[PDB]
Amino acid sequence: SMEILQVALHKRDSGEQLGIKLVRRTDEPGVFILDLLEGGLAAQDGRLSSNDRVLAINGHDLKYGTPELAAQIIQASGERVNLTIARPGKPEIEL
């Protein structure tokens, strides 16, 4: 299964970073979050997580995106930044 969630953040100046690490993988399409930076915008919000997939930013489609593209969108963004995420696969397992 997977969970779709929407995160809204707010930059406090045009030039603020979100505090997010984005990567691509050679094995499946899309951009993913690798980790959040300590004390950053994304961490404080407390809603994004490692291995989340970014499906969209500001209604722009990134399901087949690159990390350059997402940066482009966020560096151009106004002060509000809405993320649409896919979170994959069971956080508790006994094995």
From Swiss-Prot:
Organism's domain of life? Eukaryota
Q: Which residues form a coiled coil?
A: none
Residues of the signal peptide: none
PDZ domain location: 6-89
Free-text domain note = The NPXY motif is required for the interaction with the PID domain of NUMB. It is however not sufficient.
Subunit structure and binding partners: Interacts with the phosphotyrosine interaction domain of NUMB.
The entry's protein name is: Ligand of Numb protein X 2
Q: Which organism is it from?
A: Homo sapiens
**Portion of the full sequence shown:** 336 to 424 of 690
